[PDB]
């Protein structure tokens, strides 16, 4: 899932 700290991770 897209999370704000992690950018493209799992997104």
């Amino acid at each position: 899932v897209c999370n704000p700290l992690t950018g493209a991770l799992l997104c």
Partner: antibody, heavy 111, light 114 residues
Framework: VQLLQSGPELEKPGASVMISCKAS???????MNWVRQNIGKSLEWIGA????????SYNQKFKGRATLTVDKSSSTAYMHLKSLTSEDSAVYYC??????WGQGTSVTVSS | DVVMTQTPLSLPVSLGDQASISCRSS???????????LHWYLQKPGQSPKLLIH???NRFSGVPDRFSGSGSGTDFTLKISRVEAEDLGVYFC??????????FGAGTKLELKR
């Protein structure tokens, strides 16, 4: 947000451990990330999991020897760490969206 | 993978001093989408890391005014004005631009001078 990790683990070289991380306070809205803290305090990101859909991304150093899972019935994430060696004697953190950290789980590898 | 070099690695200060920590990455942390996924954590002794600054300069929930993050591209700085005891611990920078893996700086220990 609170992340409750399981207690200390002790294994022989070669073995595996399974550690848990119980989240409280939206379990499915954040990737659950895992990070090792080594003895000299350096940090190494192991991987993360999407808890609604179950997709995973790994640090290639850990790929093939660590497996992330979740249980949505109990908002609990898990890490199965295989192939243990002395370098794995460390503290392992779960981290919700890289924002909030659990208290850590010690793993000690000794014969 | 991105190498995150912090300097100094140990920073002795006096109470009330201004403290400055540098974090340099081996490649740019500005992502194609315009964001710079550079964050700062503090781990106080005996505790877990806690998020201080996200996306270069944004203070997280409850983080005092005396912490500020600056920089761009490959060169970042955390500044801690009016150091007090509760500030002592290990500061880490972290990048989530080039992933996997997320990487971290080695940690800068903020300690007292005598």
């Amino acid at each position: 947000v609170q992340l409750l990790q399981s207690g200390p683990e002790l294994e022989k070289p070669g073995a595996s451990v399974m550690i848990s991380c119980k989240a409280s306070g939206s379990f499915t809205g954040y990737n659950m990330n895992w990070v090792r803290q080594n003895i000299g305090k350096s940090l190494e990101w192991i991987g993360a999991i999407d808890p609604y859909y179950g997709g995973t991304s790994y640090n290639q150093k850990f790929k093939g020897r660590a497996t992330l899972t979740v249980d949505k019935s109990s908002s609990t994430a898990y890490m199965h760490l295989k192939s243990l060696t002395s370098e794995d004697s460390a503290v392992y953190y779960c981290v919700s969206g890289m924002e909030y950290w659990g208290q850590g789980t010690s793993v000690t590898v000794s014969s | 993978d991105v190498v995150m070099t912090q300097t100094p690695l140990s920073l002795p200060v006096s109470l009330g001093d201004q403290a400055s920590i540098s974090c340099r990455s081996s490649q740019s942390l500005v992502h194609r989408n315009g964001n710079t996924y550079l964050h700062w954590y503090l781990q106080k002794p005996g505790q877990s890391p806690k998020l201080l600054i996200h996306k270069v300069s944004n203070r997280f929930s409850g983080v005092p005014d005396r912490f500020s993050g600056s920089g761009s591209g490959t060169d970042f700085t955390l500044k801690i004005s009016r150091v007090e005891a509760e500030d002592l611990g290990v500061y880490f920078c972290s990048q989530s631009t080039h992933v996997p893996p997320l990487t971290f700086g080695a940690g800068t220990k903020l300690e007292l001078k005598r």
